[PDB]
Every structure is written in structure tokens, then in C-alpha cells.
């Protein structure tokens, strides 16, 4: 007198501008979900992947990028990346075989990179054929502590930050698919972005206390893309746990979460004394900026055990809306 449930195959055509929210869920709980928020109606729909496909998304969705009307969702602990239609949410394809996929960066319609953690290789795939095509061997990296995270492209080169137990940025030549250069910076850079001045901002987390690798004050770095040299370093206070640095549509104001939500012009010579949003007893975990109107969405995971909520604030800091999403939102994707 008990059963399992399958089905609930819903179908719906959704708006043009929207915001996707990936929900990590709990490790080995396969409760990761995808949410979709409509800024024009202030209505959010949760678990859209399961409702549209009839089966669970997987276990640890990490991030999402959209290329040509198709959204690629990386599911870290499911060894797969799902390609879905950005309008119906129905699965259009998938690529399995990944060690622990992190982020995906497209080079062309037939070539894309997928960074990984717990691997010294960056998986190369062919989005058009939905299969794994190659590997990028990272120097001075083993499987036990290998780590590649975000990627940004600069001409024929691609820069990638090495986060977990690493302290470098790699320079990859996309014409040969091999690592051709590296740069050592603070310990564990968490993210990598490119601004309108061909500058690269990255923020390190300073490791952790008692680490055999290192423990330091995390920092924000400005590195010239052309010369691949560090030009600016803004150190914060030891003990801080900032998030990955992110930029807005015009790429001239960088935002991040430290203990508050900060914002800074990329040309400034010091970190501002005033924050964008004063702390308000909310567990800031995720952050993003609307590339078209500048509205800032802050994702608070709450206790990491129940559905999280996202606050939508205007560029001036006016509360515009708030809505419950999934469990532990940590990444966003604008449509």
C-alpha cells in the first residue's frame, strides 16, 4: 500500500525575457531544480525541468549558459549537461561522461569547453553532435586536487581560473586546444570575468585556516589581458568569505557579496567605503545583475535545507519584488 510516481508531463510556452535560477539541492538527494522568474509579471515557476520532462534534473546543477535558443545546464554530480529549449524547457539533448562538470564555454557552434573539478583535464565537446570530443591537459595539476572553474575569451585565447587547491590562471590557445601559459596569483581564485577595457577581474578566497596549501586574506585582482600581468590588487580583511565577482551588461560596475553587497567601478583605485545594500540579516549566497536595466537580484539560501528566496532590488536599492525559488540558488542565467 505505497507507490512511486512518474509522469506529470507539463507543457508551456514562456516569455522572451526571463531569468533562470539553478538550484543545487542537497548532495545525493537528487533534488536539484530549475526555476524561471518573469521580471515583467513577478511570477516564478519552480521545478520546471521535472514538470516539463517527468524526471529529476539530477543532483548538483552548478551553472547555465545559453547560446542559440538552447540552454545548457551543468549538473555536477550527475556527470551530465542537459541542453533544453529556452521556451518549452523540454530536453533537446545531453552530454554524459563528465568527471564533475562546472561551467561551459562555447567557442563555436561545433566546439565548446567544459571545465571540471577533480580533474586535470578540461573536457572539449561538440555541442552540435552532443558527444565528448577531447581533453585539455592542465600543467601542474593532478586529479586528486585539479580544478578549473570559469572561462573568458580574449581573441584566440581563453583564460580560465584554477580554484580548488590552485593559485593560477591558465591561458589556452583555442587554435590548438592546449595550455600555452599560466599566471600565479592569490591562492584559489574563484571566478574570472572580462570588462569593457580588456581587463580581467578575479577574486580569490584566501584558502582556509589550517590549510597545508595556504591561508590568506582573499583579494580582488585586475590583470591586463594583453600582457597577462597583474595591474591592481585590492586586499580585503582576513576572515571574509566573498563570492564570485560578476559584472553587469555594460561591464563597467563590478558587484560581489562579502558581508554586504558591494559595487565598484572597474577604474577605481580603492574599494568604496559605502556598500550598495546594507546587511539585513539575510544569508547572501548568490548575486546577479540584470544586463538590461541593472536591477540586482540577491539569492539568500536561508538555512540551506529548505527553499531559498531571491530579492529583486532596483538599481537605486528599492525593493521591487521577492520570490521563493529552489534549494540553495547559487547561479543565475539571463534569457
Amino acid at each position: 500500500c505505497m507507490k512511486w510516481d512518474y509522469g506529470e508531463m507539463e507543457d508551456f510556452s514562456v516569455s522572451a525575457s526571463g531569468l533562470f535560477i539553478t538550484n543545487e539541492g542537497n548532495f545525493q538527494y537528487s533534488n536539484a531544480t530549475l526555476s524561471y522568474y518573469d521580471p515583467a509579471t513577478c511570477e516564478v515557476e519552480n521545478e520546471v525541468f521535472y514538470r516539463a520532462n517527468g524526471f529529476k534534473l539530477g543532483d548538483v546543477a552548478q551553472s547555465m549558459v545559453i547560446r542559440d535558443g538552447i540552454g545548457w545546464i551543468v549538473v555536477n554530480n550527475s556527470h551530465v549537461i542537459f541542453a533544453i529549449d529556452i521556451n518549452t524547457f523540454k530536453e533537446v539533448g545531453r552530454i554524459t561522461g563528465f568527471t564533475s562538470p562546472r561551467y561551459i564555454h562555447f567557442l563555436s557552434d561545433e566546439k565548446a569547453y567544459v571545465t571540471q573539478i577533480w580533474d586535470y583535464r578540461i573536457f572539449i565537446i561538440n555541442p552540435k553532435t552532443y558527444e565528448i570530443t577531447g581533453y585539455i591537459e592542465c600543467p601542474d595539476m593532478d586529479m586528486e586536487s585539479g580544478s578549473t572553474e570559469q572561462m573568458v575569451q580574449y581573441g584566440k585565447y581563453v583564460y580560465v581560473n584554477c580554484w580548488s587547491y590552485q593559485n593560477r590562471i591558465l591561458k589556452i590557445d583555442t587554435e590548438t586546444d592546449k595550455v600555452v601559459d599560466e599566471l600565479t596569483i592569490g591562492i584559489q581564485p574563484t571566478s574570472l570575468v572580462m570588462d569593457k577595457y580588456n581587463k580581467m577581474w578575479t577574486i580569490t578566497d584566501g584558502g582556509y585556516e589550517g590549510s597545508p596549501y595556504g591561508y590568506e586574506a582573499p583579494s580582488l585582482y585586475r590583470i591586463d589581458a594583453e600582457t597577462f600581468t597583474v595591474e591592481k590588487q585590492f586586499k580585503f580583511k582576513l576572515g571574509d568569505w566573498p563570492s564570485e565577482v560578476q559584472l553587469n551588461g555594460t561591464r563597467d560596475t563590478l558587484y560581489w557579496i562579502n558581508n554586504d553587497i558591494w559595487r565598484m567601478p572597474v577604474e577605481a583605485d580603492r574599494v568604496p567605503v559605502r556598500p550598495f545594500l546594507e546587511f539585513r540579516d539575510t544569508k547572501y549566497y548568490g548575486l546577479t545583475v540584470n544586463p538590461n536595466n541593472g536591477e540586482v537580484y540577491v539569492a539568500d539560501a536561508i538555512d540551506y535545507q529548505q527553499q531559498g528566496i531571491v530579492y529583486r532590488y532596483s538599481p537605486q536599492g528599492k525593493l521591487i519584488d521577492e520570490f521563493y525559488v529552489g534549494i540553495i540558488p547559487g547561479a543565475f542565467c539571463w534569457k
Binding site: 512511486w4 524526471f55 529529476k56 586529479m143 586528486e144 582556509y208 566573498p242 529548505q306
Partner: protein, 633 residues
């Protein structure tokens, strides 16, 4: 009827713990008691949780030893076979203290005893079935008027590729240029679920004419279990590799001098666990996460009960464990090009000393006070007291009421503090204020029946709970303050409705809420006054059986209410766990020979072929069977 003054403990029947050879040990608790057991597979991570209580407050005792390895304060119950236990009580709540402290939920009190069989009684049981599952057990015993010995050994192996219609993940039918055509729920096999387990226990015992008993038992286990790919794991089983080895030993020596009023005993033991975890992939293999962590522990214990006549009884006891850990989780390349490790290595003493006074003025009224002092590491825990009362309401039907109040403390574990990838070594001890009250009932030899109920209520102060950070790893924090009351009921009857028509029955039912009562964490905290996740509101379990001469049959059933996979307890399509109704049944026929006793039995699990879920994302097998053949003296 003393030392159980106001004490609530569940005693297990002789054949309740020797029903089937493998049967784990969680499968005995989960069908003759009414506590919660987080469990998915056979060779699974079966954890026991008491009334609204975390498993971290359910600590166990084997022959007086603490088996919960202090690297993480609990005991895995799939690592204990049903046939490797002779005596097993289960002290509930506030009654756990007068044997050892630190048990906020309560204690499982285990001990092996000499079977007291004279001669050579080799006993072999062999069992097959289900998904290529094979189990073997053998016991060689030696009996003597003064010496005694017994050697037991269990080996069980299975691939666990059970067929499941996977309603959790779909598979596609493609065409030219990888345009998706079809999608179906596959009928897959449990990937990387195999297991190979071996146990061996050697015990000897000494007895002289006057009351001087000696005893010694050593226990080796070698476990090699494959971590099942979770249901949404889109990875090849032959590509990936997820292995858990655990080689551990537990040994105990005992000396007991008992005479009339005064009974005294001392014990000394040692455990040593070595846990190896491996997670690898193919490029010709290579390790993704490869770790080895070993802890060894020395024991010292002394208990004594001086009971001057009746109406006064006094117990005293001491248990000191010195632990010695060696953790090592990853090998990293340090900045200097060298090779370094992230594991820590620590160790601390764990002393608990207790004194109790049982006083019964008359047969009706009786009370008792137990008082414990605990000291783990370098810190003296504040006195952990408890007080029991029992009373004979009416001699007709023995209706007896008991009640007891206490204040327990639990120290954080060595992973709770010194975990180097994690952190926060300044954690506060968990505080629990608890108090119970209940009643019991019995009526009698050509017929018999008994039962009782109780009442649970506990406030837990700042208690440990691990939280993710923005850095990708967990750290603990004493944030929540839970409020877990409840109630438990039991009833066992047996009326011989004929010359030989024995009908043995018992059943239990528990209402166990564990509502959160902490600081609302965020302005959107929906879990402020909701029950904690994975804590079933209602639980129940009935086991009944009957005998017709050499033929016997028992049926077991249990129900757990909806297990909330979310702290807020709201409904969610992706994370819904339905109520859990497991039904299983076993039957045996034996037939005695000259100097031997042959038996054949068959057991089923998951009758009705219900396709269900007990832990989120972890599949469960269909209907399964095992058939056993046994020779006994």
C-alpha cells in the same frame, strides 16, 4: 524488580535476533522496536534515531564499550550481523544514563554471552537467493565445566544489480544528427551497489566454583561495499569506481566477582578502525578522491553494585576511552611543488563516572537517583543527573506507572571540531533537558498478554548542524534549538490456543515530533516551527508469529509517516517521500535427528512488489527472497 526502577528498556526475544542469518542488525531493531532507521539498501548506511532525536544522540554499547567511533559519534548498523549478538537491551531516553552518559536519545546495550552448551556443537548455515546473494555462517563451540569457547564467522556477498523501473531519470532514442526522438523510463540495474562482508568473533570464558567469571572476545570485520550510484547518476559503472573498505577490530576482556548482595566487575577493551574511501574514473584508472583514515581506542571500565538487603541498592561505574585518530582525506600539491596532506590527527580521553541509589520503601512506591560526571578531552561536563520513580498502581494486572527526569550533555565529535577541510573547533556541548512518564500492564500460564505506553518531551539547546559555505565545503554551527516530544507504546501477547498452537505477538507505535524551536535564521525562514527533515511524524511496527509443532511462521510490518526532505515541510514534486509500509515474512520447518538438528527456512522482503522510495534519489529493489539451510546442535 530493581535497577529498572522507573527505567524504560526494550528487551528482544531470543528468535527476534536469530531469525535470518544476514538480517543485518538494523533489520532486527526496525521490526521489533519503533525507532527511525534511515536506510536504503541491504548493505546500506542504516542509521537509528530515537524519539524525535538525531542519530548523534543514539550511542551504543558492546560488552560495556563505546562502539560509536569518536571521529563521528554514531554506529553503522549494517556492520553488525544478527547472529553475532546474544544479549541486547535498549535503554530509552533518560533511562540510558544509569549505564553511560552522553546519550540524549538513548542507548543500545549489547553484550555477547557464553551459550553454555557442553561439548562440540559446530553449526553451519548456508543461504542463497535474491540478486545472486550468498550468505554463509559457521559456529564452532567448545564446552566444559570450567572453560568455554566459541568461534563464529559470517561471509556475505552479492552484486546487488536489482531490476528497477527508474522513475527518476529517462533515456532517449535518437536518430540522424542526434535529434532526440524518444524518451522512456529505463528498467535499469543498481549501479555500483555490490558488497562483500566478513565477520569473525572469537570468545573464551572462565568460571570457578566460587563467583569469579572471566571472559574475552575479539571481533574482526572486513567490509568492502560499493557505493550505489544515485538514481540520477548518468555515469558508466565500468567507467567510475566508488569503493568503501572498512577493516576494524573490537575486543573486550571482563572479570566479574559476584556474591549475594555485592556484584562487581571490571572490563578493558580496544577498537581499531581503518576506513578507506576510493572514487576513481577511467582516462588506466586514476584516483579522483582517495583517502585512508584510521582510529584506535583504548578502554577502561569498572562497575559495582552494593545492595544491602532489600529497599536499598547503590551502583557506581566508570568508563574511560582514550581515542587516537589519524585522518587523511586528500593529497594536494603545495605551493612549493612539494606534496602535502589535508588530514589532521588528534585524540582525547572520554571519562564518565556514575553513582546511583535505588530506594523502594514498600512494594508500591520506589525511586532512584543516578548522577554522572563526564569529562571528554580537558573539559568537565556539568553534572548529568537523572531521577526515576515507579509505582504499583494496582497489583491486579501489575499496572505500574513510571516517570523520570534528566539533563543530558553530548560533546561534539573529533570531526565536529578538528576536521581540517571543515572547521569550527570551538563548538558548544549539546544540552538536553528531558522528562518522561508512562504506564505498563500484564496479565497471565496457559495464556498471557502485556503492554504499556509512555510520554516523551525534550528540549535540545544549541545543537550541532553542518552548513555549506560560499567556498564549497561544510562547517558546523550551534544554531538550532529543537523541541522533540513524543510517545511510545508496546504490547506483546501469547495465548496457547491448543495443545501446541503457540501464537507469539508484539507491536509498537510511536508519535515522534521534533519541531524546530530555534532562532528563525532568515526573514524567509519557513522552518521556524516545522518538524525537522527526515523525521517521521508517526511510526508503527507489528510482528506476529505462530507455531504448529516443528513448523513456524512470522510476519513483520512497519509504517513510517511522510519523511520531510525539506526543513520547511512544504510539498515538493522533486523531493516528496511517501509513507513507508514495509511488509516481510519468513517461515521455517525443522526436524530433529540423532545428535543433530536440521532446519530449512525462507524469508521474503518487500512483499507485494511495491516500487517505492525510502531515501530520496536512492532506488529500492523489488520483491526479494532468500532461502537458508541450517545445521545446529
Amino acid at each position: 524488580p530493581m535497577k529498572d526502577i522507573g527505567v524504560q528498556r526494550t528487551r528482544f526475544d531470543s528468535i527476534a535476533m536469530k531469525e535470518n542469518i544476514a538480517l543485518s542488525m538494523a533489520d532486527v531493531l526496525t521490526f521489533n522496536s519503533s525507532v527511525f532507521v534511515k536506510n536504503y539498501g541491504r548493505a546500506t548506511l542504516s542509521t537509528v534515531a530515537f524519539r524525535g532525536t538525531s542519530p548523534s544522540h543514539t550511542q551504543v554499547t558492546w560488552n560495556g564499550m563505546r562502539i560509536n567511533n569518536p571521529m563521528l559519534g554514531m554506529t553503522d548498523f549494517s556492520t553488525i550481523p544478527s547472529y553475532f549478538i546474544d544479549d541486547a537491551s535498549l535503554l530509552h531516553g533518560t533511562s540510558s544514563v544509569n549505564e553511560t552518559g552522553g546519550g540524549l536519545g538513548g542507548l543500545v546495550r549489547l553484550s555477547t554471552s557464553p551459550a553454555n552448551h557442553e561439548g562440540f556443537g559446530l553449526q553451519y548455515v548456508q543461504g542463497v537467493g535474491s540478486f545472486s546473494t550468498f550468505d554463509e555462517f559457521l559456529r564452532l563451540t567448545y564446552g566444559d565445566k570450567h572453560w568455554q569457547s566459541s568461534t563464529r564467522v559470517v561471509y556475505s556477498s552479492s552484486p546487488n544489480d536489482y531490476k528497477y523501473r527508474n522513475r527518476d531519470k529517462k533515456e532517449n532514442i535518437y536518430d540522424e544528427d542526434k535529434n532526440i526522438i524518444g524518451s522512456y523510463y529505463p528498467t535499469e540495474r543498481n549501479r555500483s551497489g555490490a558488497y562483500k562482508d566478513l565477520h569473525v568473533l572469537q570468545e573464551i570464558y572462565y568460571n570457578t566454583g566460587e563467583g569469579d567469571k572471566f571472559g574475552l572476545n575479539a571481533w574482526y570485520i572486513n567490509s568492502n561495499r560499493e557505493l550505489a550510484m544515485l538514481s540520477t547518476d548518468y555515469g558508466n559503472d565500468m567507467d567510475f569506481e566508488n569503493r568503501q573498505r572498512e577493516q576494524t577490530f573490537r575486543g573486550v576482556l571482563s572479570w566479574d566477582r559476584v556474591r549475594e548482595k555485592w556484584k562487581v566487575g571490571v572490563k578493558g577493551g580496544y577498537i581499531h578502525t581503518w576506513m578507506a574511501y576510493d572514487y576513481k574514473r577511467d582516462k588506466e584508472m586514476a584516483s579522483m578522491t582517495r583517502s585512508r583514515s584510521k582510529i584506535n581506542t583504548f578502554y577502561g571500565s569498572a562497575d559495582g553494585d552494593y545492595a544491602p538487603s532489600e529497599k536499598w541498592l547503590f551502583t557506581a561505574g566508570v568508563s574511560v576511552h582514550q581515542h587516537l585518530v589519524e585522518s587523511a582525506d586528500k593529497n594536494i600539491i603545495s605551493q612549493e611543488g612539494n606534496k602535502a596532506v589535508v588530514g589532521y590527527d588528534k585524540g582525547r580521553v572520554e571519562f564518565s563516572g556514575s553513582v546511583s541509589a535505588k530506594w523502594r520503601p514498600v512494594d508500591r512506591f520506589a525511586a532512584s537517583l543516578v548522577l554522572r560526571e563526564d569529562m571528554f578531552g580537558t573539559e568537565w561536563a556539568p553534572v548529568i543527573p537523572a531521577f526515576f520513580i515507579d509505582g504499583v498502581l494496582s497489583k491486579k494486572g501489575n499496572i505500574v506507572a513510571k516517570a523520570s527526569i534528566s539533563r543530558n550533555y553530548r560533546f561534539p565529535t573529533l570531526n565536529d571540531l578538528y576536521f581540517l577541510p571543515g572547521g569550527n573547533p570551538d563548538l558548544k556541548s549539546e544540552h538536553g533537558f528531558t522528562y518522561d512518564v508512562g504506564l505498563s500492564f500484564s496479565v497471565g500460564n496457559v495464556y498471557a498478554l502485556s503492554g504499556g505506553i509512555n510520554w516523551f518531551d525534550s528540549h535540545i539547546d544549541d545543537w550541532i548542524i553542518w552548513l555549506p559555505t560560499t567556498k564549497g565545503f561544510f562547517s558546523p554551527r550551534n544554531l538550532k534549538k529543537v523541541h522533540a516530544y513524543g510517545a511510545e507504546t508496546n504490547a506483546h501477547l501469547d495465548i496457547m490456543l491448543g495443545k501446541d498452537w503457540k501464537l507469539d505477538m508484539n507491536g509498537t507505535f510511536s508519535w515522534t515530533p521534533s519541531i524546530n524551536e530555534s532562532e528563525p535564521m532568515s526573514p524567509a525562514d519557513q522552518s521556524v516551527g516545522k518538524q525537522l527533515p527526515y523525521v517521521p511524524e508517526f511510526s508503527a511496527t507489528v510482528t506476529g508469529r505462530l507455531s504448529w509443532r516443528t513448523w513456524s511462521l512470522l510476519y513483520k510490518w512497519c509504517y513510517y509517516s511522510q519523511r520531510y526532505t525539506m526543513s520547511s515541510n512544504d510539498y515538493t514534486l522533486t523531493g516528496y517521500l511517501p509513507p513507508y509500509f514495509m511488509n516481510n515474512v519468513t517461515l521455517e520447518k525443522q526436524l530433529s535427528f540423532r545428535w543433530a538438528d536440521l532446519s530449512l527456512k525462507g524469508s521474503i522482503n518487500n512483499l507485494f512488489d511495491e516500487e517505492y522510495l525510502s531515501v530520496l534519489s536512492r532506488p529500492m529493489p523489488g520483491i526479494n527472497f532468500e532461502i537458508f539451510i541450517g545445521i545446529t546442535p
